[PDB]
Write a protein that binds this ligand. Structure first.
Ligand code: NA
Lengths: 48, 48, 156
């Protein structure tokens, strides 16, 4: 069934007025709240 | 919708007036391409 | 939150008029709220269930109940184009100039979705046409940005 969800609207005019890129806004929100797969490291001979 | 693409904010001028995408372009629901035009017994048609 | 409170939230949402009737008779909490602060009236207003909006207000539902972000049933009804529910809420004393945490009013929301009939009703019950949100935007600013010619002419 449909469930409550948190709609957030980015004001494009306010972002442009303060000199804040939408990429930086969407990355900050996504990375922090959603998580972001950056790249791989090698843990005891295994790529992770 | 065309209306939503129309109100895309390209920039805000020095005096605070907004330049929207509809101010620099006509926005319509049109074909991916305009190469193929089909008629069936003279009248407008599409087909597979 | 009670057993019947949860049952009423689900029934108000689903539009099950006959089940709401039975729950009103057994004294199901009309001020019952879920985790986001939505009452049965909020839910009925959102999903557009007129009969249940009327029944809940008869049974002493808070017409100006607000969720955890300051949104009222009139906000929801105005935003989703439910004209009849907007009229009923306003007749039962809904704050026509109710501001959520963003400074957004029923007039702002109705203007945004181009609900002309609802805008006229809100203005008739004395909606503040000069009311600004957190970005200093009026219902008129929304009408010209959306390019709504009819709406822009009414918000003169
Ligand atoms: Na982006």
């Amino acid at each position: 069934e449909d469930t409550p969800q948190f709609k957030i609207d980015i004001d494009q005019e306010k972002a442009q007025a303060l000199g804040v890129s939408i990429n930086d806004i969407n990355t900050t929100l996504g990375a922090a709240w959603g998580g972001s797969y950056v790249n791989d490291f090698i843990d005891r001979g295994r790529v992770k | 919708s065309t209306e939503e693409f129309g109100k895309i904010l390209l920039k805000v001028n020095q005096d605070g007036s907004r330049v929207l995408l509809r101010d620099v372009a006509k926005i319509e629901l049109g074909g991916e391409n305009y190469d193929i035009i089909a008629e069936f017994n003279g009248q407008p048609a599409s087909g597979l | 939150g009670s057993d019947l409170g949860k049952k009423l939230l689900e029934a108000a949402r689903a539009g099950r008029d006959d089940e709401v009737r039975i729950l009103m008779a057994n004294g199901a909490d009309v001020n019952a709220a879920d985790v986001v602060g939505w009452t049965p009236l909020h839910l009925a207003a959102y999903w557009g269930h007129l009969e249940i909006v009327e029944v809940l207000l008869k049974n002493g539902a808070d017409v100006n109940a607000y969720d955890t972000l300051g949104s009222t049933p009139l906000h929801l009804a105005a935003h989703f184009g439910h004209l009849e529910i907007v009229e009923v809420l306003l007749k039962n004393g809904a704050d026509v100039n109710a501001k959520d945490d963003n400074g957004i009013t029923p007039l702002h929301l109705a203007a945004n979705r181009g609900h002309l009939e609802i805008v006229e009703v809100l203005l008739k019950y004395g909606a503040d046409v000069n009311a600004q949100d957190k970005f200093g935007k009026t219902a008129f600013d929304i009408s010209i940005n959306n390019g709504n010619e009819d709406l822009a002419e009414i918000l003169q």
